[PDB]
Design a binder for this molecule. Structure first.
Ligand SMILES: CCCCCCCCCCCCCCCCCC(=O)OC[C@H](COP(=O)([O-])OCC(O)COP(=O)([O-])OC[C@@H](COC(=O)CCCCCCCCCCCCCCCCC)OC(=O)CCCCCCCCCCCCCCCCC)OC(=O)CCCCCCCCCCCCCCCCC
Ligand SMILES: CCCCCCCCCCCCCCCCCC(=O)OC[C@H](COP(=O)([O-])OCC(O)COP(=O)([O-])OC[C@@H](COC(=O)CCCCCCCCCCCCCCCCC)OC(=O)CCCCCCCCCCCCCCCCC)OC(=O)CCCCCCCCCCCCCCCCC
Ligand SMILES: CCCCCCCCCCCCCCCCCC(=O)OC[C@H](COP(=O)([O-])OCC(O)COP(=O)([O-])OC[C@@H](COC(=O)CCCCCCCCCCCCCCCCC)OC(=O)CCCCCCCCCCCCCCCCC)OC(=O)CCCCCCCCCCCCCCCCC
Ligand code: HEA
Ligand code: HEA
Ligand SMILES: CCCCCCCC/C=C\CCCCCCCC(=O)OC[C@H](COP(=O)(O)OCCN)OC(=O)CCCCCCC/C=C\CCCCCCCC
Ligand SMILES: CCCCCCCC/C=C\CCCCCCCC(=O)OC[C@H](COP(=O)(O)OCCN)OC(=O)CCCCCCC/C=C\CCCCCCCC
Ligand SMILES: CCCCCCCC/C=C\CCCCCCCC(=O)OC[C@H](COP(=O)(O)OCCN)OC(=O)CCCCCCC/C=C\CCCCCCCC
Ligand SMILES: CCCCCCCC/C=C\CCCCCCCC(=O)OC[C@H](COP(=O)(O)OCCN)OC(=O)CCCCCCC/C=C\CCCCCCCC
Ligand SMILES: [O-][O-]
Ligand SMILES: [Cu+2]
Ligand SMILES: [K+]
Ligand SMILES: [Zn+2]
Lengths: 226, 76, 103, 107, 65, 124, 459, 196
């Protein structure tokens, strides 16, 4: 959005030193129990394990492929929530302009709390009036006293929580078959051999499953000076 | 050029020249050194420092000939 | 995560606080001095402020008084000059070496 | 200059011959200084003050919609007295235009 | 917290200690004294009286008092 | 922005209520006095409650000290005129206390005549 | 905390609180002046202590202008509502806002301390040289206060200008009023600082700008190049308040919003180019005098448009609404009072009329009707409108018809007679006067004591 | 078209596996870009050279499956298989298949209103139109009344002003007769007082 500042380096990828060292437990943790860093590396390890196995991709369904990469198959419930989330974020630093509100289609006023201050400017052209500010509280269909424009408050609330991308992913995504560490090892040997590492994440991940320091050059990789 | 700046005529004290309402002390509010001399009037201060030295009070400057010091820019 | 009860019964049975009593226009004239001289928190804060303000006023006062007396006696060079005339009188010499220098 | 919303004669035609202008009182009620209970502590007096806000009041019309307390300026939209942090969620000034895009509709 | 919602919550909820008000009025009273006390001091310094007697700088009748 | 200052947070529940040992609810200081006097008038005023609403604001005599209850009970045009004159009279009285018996010589009849002579000579 | 707070609304309260405190000293000085002027003779100041009177009038003017009305109308109400009107969480520069109020207090302490410790002499609030530069150290202290005050004013102006970058709603007329005052400060203050530094140079650095062959009239140009913009920096915030009160209380949308805004912009530009109407009697060139007189009379046009737009706001309002609220009465009283002050301003604008009326009490009454009556009442009306939002209590003002009537009557008793003595004529900045001017001076003095008594009834 | 063409974030490669741009202070190593172009080959020249993505051939069957399931995606996948997909081609593919999130109004809970209240919607709209009709007409009526009244003020201010015109008129007549006829005017009357 225009109100956001510049992408960080982390916005693209995370450093491999932030990979959890207990990979064996990481790949067995349920999604609802994974933190932001743990969830990043669960998806990256599992997603790259399937993508770096070309011979199996054509026989893998889009439902299974999306699960491996950690992408959520969309549906009307989740689409509604995500859309209203992105609309809330956009309105943080953007103007609020849209069609005239009526009983059939009230002006939708997203909010996290139970109230949001709103102003009615009336219709277009000569039907526009001076700003009339009012407090839009949930559970009431508001009508402007001047132009009769109907307003309504929409709350991004779900089960004692507000709506977030993390909440939407946890509520609607279902964990599939438990990730098999044999796949990690098999793909690791595929792209990492004879001092050539073409899957750096899988070389670090396999090292942790082995106990940290087992694979060649990994003790030297983990030895820091400050 | 500044190191060998030519002498200029002594200014005649004209109708509106050298007017003073009080002594020059803004540089030394408490010590009040050279109250009669102006802030960067080097020749007045030299003679004033000489009086203080003759009164057993040490002051710094205005004692070495220019041609006997480094960085003077006044040597032939 | 902390667990608290809905209510607590206090050990004492004193109703110390409540609504203000009806006050007149000049009620402050006696209530305010009463607080100053009878409420501990008020007169301990006053004494603390007065004591420490005066405490640090003394050393500054002593330094300035000596300085002020000196400045009235004359300029720095007038003081050194008086000690130079005295040294010239003690020795009976019209011209003596400057301080820190030999003959 | 603003002279109210434009009305077409068709919109002034009643659906019954007995329709008159609804006589709903827009006086919110009788008020005075907010009166706190002595028993209430600082926290509970704060709740009391938050429940006496006129700008949270409205008038419900015959069709169930409510006309809220409205003001020309947003100064009357914060709690009285003003809290330390007022507009946490950015107040939304709604502008109206005739532009539309197809994605919003479904056939 | 509910106590922190309102700025100056104790005063707004009518629980503040009255001493705060007394200090504010005292501060104003001291400010006022800065115009009266130097008047009295300056009058005495240059005349010997804290305040004049109306028209005592002009010629007065014998019975004037 | 994950982990930034939340847009909205719910208030935590208020601290436990305090009772006295006998069960009486503990009362806290309250600066809303019930002034003692014989006045019981109640004045109501229609007030702006935004753009489309009003509120009937009432002022009760017991909410005010005796001096205001007394003054606010009377008709405005009975009190106002008397008060205006009274304040003016008091001001003059205050300003006359410091000049009781002061008799400058320039206001005596002799000096008054001499000024008339000067005006005649100068055609003032 | 108390001093550390950065909350913009708390700081707004501090500005009003400090203005009332410093205001007590201001009013006391005014009472001294009026008491002295009650008759001819010496009343409360000895003939050997006449220098004190000169100091009283000087400090009265300086404090009321820079430490009371300006901190109240440009620092108090603005810091409390402007960020709300702009639908923004808080002021753009939080830390700068805190230091500004602290600076004002520190400069006030310096001034009052200089009363107590330094010899008491005066040179007017306009600090004309050479008199200002041949005085004692109290003049040096006052200069430090003004320069320090200037720092607070400029940084506060920078703070308000930044609202344009963050405003999330519509720039209402009031917001426009503050922004333009901020612009007027950014352009006028740097010139004031320069001339004040030159006063210091002559006082403290043996400079010779204000001795023969140096033009003393130079100071008056640079001073008044800030002076007159200052009088509009003090009135424009009041105009912004009046607009909000009339629209809100009458439930009527502002009429000619863009003309109101463009009238404020116009007043500022014109107010930046008319300063020499304060220098009519010095002996300026005929064409200069005619230019300044012409442009000074033009300022009435934009100022007149605003007045008439206010009148139609009150016209036609519903009768059922109670009209005795103190805020509404004060707002209406402002229109009635400001017209008197402005019209007399146009009279003095004619230079030939000004020859007779310069340095007379007619000028006093003129700027009192606008400031001592109009600006004060506007600040009171604005605070009164925000009583619920601010939350103060323990006063009987909101509905007090006695206070409004007594104030209006008695304030006019003070300054209406000062117009009369302007054609008598009684010079300004004097304490003794001829016996034939006692009547009017006495009437005004009775008015001053009475107004003070009415200030006690609010509590 | 932003930041002068300099990407905010970009990849750099180094030939020496143990090279550190912050610890070492050698002067022989030349950094490369994301495509591998050495830094000594200027951007203007390297950006003209055509770089295409080469995936291992074992991926061709997968890229073929994607094209068949989504025919609109086939031309991009074919370019990738044939090693003809540049970075720009990839970007076009990426943004072509991005879709906006959808909001469904049918899923929004509504403020509670009884069936009796819902049947009165037309009546309330009818009242609102009549209120707007009455408002608009009253504006014309009031504007005419009050602006006409302001004329009474003009006439009252013209009468009161004319009173002072008449006083001024008589004043000037009187002044013209002072030096001509008034006995108050005296000449050869005032004598110098002299120094006291
Ligand atoms: C123009 C006038 C008329 C106007 C009329 C129109 C008005 C319209 C309405 C205007 C409304 C504006 C908006 C109002 C918003 C109010 C918000 C508010 O209340 O905020 C909460 C705020 C604080 O409440 P809080 O949140 O509970 O604060 C808790 C504390 O933070 C923490 O509590 P704490 O107890 O811990 O506090 C610490 C406390 C601790 O205090 C103590 O311990 C005090 C102990 C007792 C001391 C008492 C004083 C003793 C004096 C002795 C003097 C001796 C002289 C001897 C002379 C001998 C001669 C021979 O204090 C200190 O330690 C520091 C105190 C420093 C300040 C006081 C300074 C006094 C003057 C000093 C002068 C020094 C001169 C030196 C010169 C040296 C030269 C060399 O309220 C106040 O501060 C009080 C405000 C009260 C007035 C509000 C407005 C009411 C409406 C207007 C009424 C009319 C007023 C007229 C002006 C005054 C006339 C006099
Ligand atoms: C051998 C030597 C070698 C060389 C050595 C060189 C050494 C170099 C050293 C360089 C540094 C030196 C300076 C260090 C400063 C440190 C600042 C700092 O970090 O403090 C943190 C420190 C934080 O404290 P804390 O340790 O966390 O705890 C504080 C307490 O718990 C209290 O908690 P609180 O902060 O919440 O309470 C504060 C508040 C609590 O509130 C109250 O007391 C009650 C509520 C208010 C009552 C009504 C007051 C009147 C209305 C005022 C409205 C405007 C207020 C504006 C905001 C406040 C501005 C002060 O009351 C006050 O303390 C002041 C209240 C306002 C007083 C002024 C009001 C006007 C009076 C006018 C009278 C005359 C007319 O700051 C403070 O709290 C105190 C700062 C004090 C600064 C004093 C500066 C005074 C300057 C005066 C003028 C000077 C020239 C003339 C003087 C003549 C004297 C005879
Ligand atoms: C430009 C621009 O992008 O402005 C917005 C832009 C902010 O972006 P934004 O998000 O679009 O702002 C939302 C709006 O503020 C929200 O505005 P809105 O959407 O509610 O209303 C639309 C329009 C509403 O505003 C307008 O459309 C107003 C446009 C006209 C303004 C008045 C012009 C001057 C009067 C006419 C002069 C005629 C001279 C003829 C000479 C003839 C010679 C032959 O917005 C603006 O124009 C906003 C900017 C207003 C800037 C005002 C700057 C100060 C004006 C000073 C006037 C003159 C004072 C004279 C003092 C005495 C001098 C001796 O402004 C800034 O970036 C503010 C920077 C402030 C820097 C201050 C320090 C400067 C040194
Ligand atoms: C906020 C305060 C304020 C305000 C608004 C004004 C406004 C004006 N002032 Fe000012 N003035 C002062 C404060 C103020 N003044 C002070 C403090 C001094 C003395 C400083 C000192 O000397 O120490 C001073 C001094 C002063 C003098 C100096 C006289 C002298 O030194 O002898 C003059 C003369 O030009 C002047 C003129 C004006 C004019 C022409 C206006 C105009 O703004 C007035 C405009 C308003 C109207 C004209 C009325 C409303 C308009 C209409 C009703 C439209 C119809 C009217 C007409 C068509 C005319 N002022
Ligand atoms: C805005 C500034 C201001 C204000 C309010 C006043 C108010 C008053 N002034 Fe003013 N006065 C000046 C600014 C002001 N004056 C200036 C600039 C000069 C010229 C200085 C000079 O000559 O060098 C001057 C000169 C001046 C003189 C001339 C003395 C002389 O030079 O010979 C006299 C006495 O005749 C006088 C009297 C009064 C009186 C009786 C009041 C008032 O007391 C009348 C009664 C009104 C009140 C008592 C209410 C005031 C209340 C507040 C100000 C607080 C407001 C705060 C809030 C609302 C939060 N003033
Ligand atoms: C911060 C600014 C610091 C300035 C330090 C230097 C000041 C300085 O040089 O001032 C002297 C300079 C030249 O004056 P004279 O010495 O008389 O010239 C004779 C030439 N022979 O000007 C002044 O005296 C004015 C000084 C004003 C105060 C400066 C410090 C603030
Ligand atoms: C007699 C002169 C006027 C005195 C006066 O009104 O002082 C009021 C003022 C504030 O008191 P209250 O308004 O009652 O505030 C406490 C909480 N309600 O009282 C004081 O400051 C008392 C001390 C005054 C000393 C004056 C010297
Ligand atoms: C002999 C006579 C001599 C007279 C000398 C007169 C000296 C006059 C000095 C005037 C200095 C004015 C400086 C103003 C600086 C600009 C102010 C400004 O807007 O700065 C903002 C900026 C940061 O904004 P925040 O509030 O932190 O915002 C946080 C959220 N983003 O502030 C700063 O960095 C300012 C730092 C310096 C302090 C400036 C203000 C206080 C006055 C300082 C006076 C210093 C000299 C004495
Ligand atoms: C606001 C920014 C623009 C301000 C422009 C102001 C110009 C006004 C013009 C007034 C005028 O005619 O100037 C005359 C007048 C002097 O007149 P007399 O003393 O009679 O001398 C004339 C012959 N001896 O000029 C001045 O004083 C000009 C002062 C300089 C203003 C400079 C403003 C700089 C702003 C940045
Ligand atoms: O000053 O007008
Ligand atoms: Cu002016
Ligand atoms: K007198
Ligand atoms: Zn509307």
């Amino acid at each position: 959005y225009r109100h956001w500042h510049r992408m960080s380096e982390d916005d693209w990828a995370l450093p491999l030193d932030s990979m959890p060292e207990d990979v064996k437990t990481l790949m067995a943790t349920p999604q609802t129990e994974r933190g932001f860093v743990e969830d990043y590396w669960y998806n990256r390890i599992r997603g790259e394990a399937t993508l770096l196995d070309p011979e199996a991709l054509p026989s893998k369904s889009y439902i299974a492929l999306a699960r491996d990469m950690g992408l959520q198959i969309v549906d009307e419930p989740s689409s509604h929530m995500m859309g209203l989330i992105e609309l809330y974020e956009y309105l943080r630093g953007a103007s609020f302009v849209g069609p005239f509100g009526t009983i059939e289609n009230p002006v939708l006023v997203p909010a996290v709390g139970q109230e949001r201050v709103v102003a009615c400017t009336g219709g277009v052209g000569d039907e526009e009036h001076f700003t009339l500010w009012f407090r839009c509280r949930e559970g009431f269909m508001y009508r402007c006293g001047e132009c009769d424009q109907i307003f309504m408050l929409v709350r991004l609330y779900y089960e004692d929580r507000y709506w977030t991308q993390t909440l939407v992913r946890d509520t609607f995504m279902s964990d599939g078959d438990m990730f098999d560490l044999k796949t990690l090892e098999r793909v690791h040997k595929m792209w990492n051999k004879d001092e050539m590492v073409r899957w750096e994440v899988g070389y670090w991940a396999q090292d942790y499953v082995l106990g940290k320091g087992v694979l060649p050059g990994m003790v030297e990789e983990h030895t820091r000076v400050n | 050029h500044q190191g060998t700046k030519p002498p200029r005529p002594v200014s005649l004290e004209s109708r509106f020249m050298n007017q003073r309402r009080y002594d020059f002390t803004w540089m030394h509010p408490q010590d009040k050194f050279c109250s009669e001399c102006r802030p960067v009037e080097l020749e007045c201060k030299k003679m004033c420092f000489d009086r203080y030295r003759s009164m057993d009070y040490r002051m710094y400057g205005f004692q070495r000939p220019r041609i006997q010091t480094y960085y003077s820019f006044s040597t032939c | 995560g902390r667990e608290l009860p809905e209510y607590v019964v206090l050990p004492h049975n004193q109703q110390r606080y409540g609504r203000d009593k009806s006050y007149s226009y000049f009620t402050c004239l006696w209530h305010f001095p009463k607080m100053v001289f009878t409420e501990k928190w008020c007169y301990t804060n006053i004494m603390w402020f007065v004591f420490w303000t005066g405490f640090w006023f003394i050393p500054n006062y002593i330094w300035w008084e000596r300085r002020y007396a000196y400045q009235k006696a004359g300029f720095h060079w007038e003081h050194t000059n008086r000690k130079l005339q005295a040294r010239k009188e003690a020795l009976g010499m019209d011209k003596v070496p400057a301080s820190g220098m030999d003959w | 200059i603003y002279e109210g919303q434009t009305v077409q004669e068709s919109e002034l035609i009643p659906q019954e011959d007995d329709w008159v202008i609804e006589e709903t009182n827009f006086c919110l009620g009788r008020n005075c200084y907010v009166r706190f209970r002595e028993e209430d502590d600082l926290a509970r007096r704060a709740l009391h003050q938050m429940d006496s806000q006129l700008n949270k009041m409205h008038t419900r019309l015959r069709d169930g919609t409510v006309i809220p307390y409205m003001s020309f300026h947003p100064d009357e939209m914060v709690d009285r007295p003003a809290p330390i942090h007022t507009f946490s969620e950015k107040p939304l000034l709604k502008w109206t235009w005739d532009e539309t895009y197809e994605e919003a509709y479904d056939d | 917290n509910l106590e922190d919602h309102f700025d100056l919550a104790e005063y707004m909820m009518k629980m503040h200690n009255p001493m705060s008000e007394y200090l504010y009025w005292i501060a104003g009273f001291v400010s006022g004294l800065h115009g009266i006390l130097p008047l009295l001091h300056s009058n005495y310094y240059f005349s010997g009286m804290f305040l004049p007697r109306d028209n005592d700088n002009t010629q007065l009748c014998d019975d004037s008092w | 922005r994950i982990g930034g200052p939340p847009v909205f947070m719910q208030f935590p529940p208020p601290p436990p209520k305090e009772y006295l040992a006998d069960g009486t609810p503990k009362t806290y200081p309250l600066h809303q006095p019930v002034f003692d006097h014989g006045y019981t008038w109640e004045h109501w005023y229609m007030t702006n409650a935004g753009v489309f609403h009003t509120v009937y604001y009432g002022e009760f005599a017991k909410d005010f000290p005796w001096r205001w209850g007394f003054v606010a009970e009377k008709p405005f045009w009975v009190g106002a005129p008397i008060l205006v004159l009274g304040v003016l009279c008091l001001g003059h009285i205050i300003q006359t206390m410091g000049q009781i018996g002061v008799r400058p010589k320039r206001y005596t009849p002799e000096w008054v005549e001499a000024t008339k002579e000067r005006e005649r000579a100068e055609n003032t | 905390f108390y001093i550390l707070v950065n909350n913009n609304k708390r700081i707004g309260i501090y500005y009003i609180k400090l203005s009332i405190i410093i205001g007590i000293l201001g009013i006391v000085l005014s009472y001294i002046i009026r008491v002295e002027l009650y008759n001819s003779g010496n009343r409360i100041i000895k003939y050997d202590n006449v220098n004190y009177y000169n100091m009283v009038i000087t400090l009265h003017g300086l404090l009321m202008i820079f430490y009371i009305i300006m901190p109240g109308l440009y620092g108090g109400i603005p810091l409390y509502i402007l960020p709300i009107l702009s639908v923004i969480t808080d002021i753009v520069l939080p830390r700068i806002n805190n230091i500004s109020i602290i600076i004002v207090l520190i400069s006030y302490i310096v001034v009052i301390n200089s009363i107590v410790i330094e010899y008491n002499i005066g040179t007017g609030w306009t600090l004309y040289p050479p008199l200002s530069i041949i005085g004692t150290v109290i003049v040096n202290m006052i200069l430090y206060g003004l320069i320090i005050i200037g720092i607070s004013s400029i940084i506060s102006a920078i703070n308000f200008m930044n609202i344009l970058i963050v405003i999330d709603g519509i720039i209402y007329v009031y917001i426009w009023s503050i922004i333009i005052t901020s612009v007027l400060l950014i352009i006028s203050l740097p010139i004031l600082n320069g001339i004040l530094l030159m006063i210091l140079s002559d006082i403290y650095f043996n400079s010779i700008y204000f001795i023969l062959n140096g033009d003393v009239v130079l100071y008056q140009h640079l001073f008044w190049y800030f002076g007159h913009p200052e009088v509009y920096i003090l009135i424009l915030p009041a105009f912004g308040i009046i607009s909000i009160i009339l629209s809100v209380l009458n439930n009527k949308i502002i009429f000619g919003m863009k003309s109101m805004i463009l009238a404020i912009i116009m007043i500022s530009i014109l107010g930046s180019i008319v300063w020499a109407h304060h220098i009519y009697t010095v002996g300026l060139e005929l064409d200069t005098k005619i230019y300044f007189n012409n442009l000074t009379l033009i300022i009435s046009i934009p100022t007149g448009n605003k007045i008439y737009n206010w009148i139609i706001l009150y016209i036609g309002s519903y009768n059922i609404l109670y009209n005795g609220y103190q805020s509404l009465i004060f707002s209406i009283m402002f229109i009635i009072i400001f017209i008197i002050g402005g019209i007399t301003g146009i009279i003095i604008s004619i230079d030939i009329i000004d020859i007779g009326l310069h340095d007379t009490y007619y000028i006093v009454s003129h700027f009192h009707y606008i400031l001592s009556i109009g600006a004060v009442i506007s600040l009171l009306a604005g605070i009164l409108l925000l009583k619920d939002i601010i939350g103060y209590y323990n006063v009987i003002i909101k509905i007090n018809k006695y206070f409004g009537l007594l104030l209006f009557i008695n304030i006019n008793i003070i300054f209406t007679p000062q117009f009369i003595i302007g054609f008598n004529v009684m010079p300004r900045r004097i304490l003794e006067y001829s016996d034939n001017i006692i009547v009017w001076n006495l009437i005004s003095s009775i008015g001053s004591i009475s107004t003070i008594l009415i200030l006690l009834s609010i509590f | 078209a932003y930041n002068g063409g300099y990407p905010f974030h970009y990849v750099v490669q180094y030939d020496d596996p143990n090279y550190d741009c912050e610890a070492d202070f050698e002067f022989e190593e030349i950094p490369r870009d994301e495509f591998g172009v050495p830094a000594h080959i200027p951007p203007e020249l390297s950006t003209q050279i055509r770089h295409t993505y080469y995936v291992p051939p074992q991926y061709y069957p997968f890229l073929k499956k994607l094209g068949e399931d989504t025919p609109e995606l086939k031309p991009y996948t074919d370019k990738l298989i044939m090693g003809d997909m540049t970075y720009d081609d990839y970007e076009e593919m990426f943004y072509k298949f991005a879709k906006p999130l959808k909001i469904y109004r049918s899923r929004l809970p509504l403020p509670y209103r009884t069936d009796e209240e819902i049947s009165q919607e037309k009546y309330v709209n009818w009242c609102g139109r009549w209120y707007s009709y009455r408002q608009r007409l009253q504006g014309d009526y009031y504007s005419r009344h009050y602006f006409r009244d302001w004329l009474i003020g003009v006439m009252l201010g013209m009468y009161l002003g004319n009173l002072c015109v008449q006083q001024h008129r008589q004043y000037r007549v009187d002044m013209k007769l002072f030096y001509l006829e008034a006995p108050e005017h005296k000449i050869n009357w005032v004598k110098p007082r002299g120094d006291l």
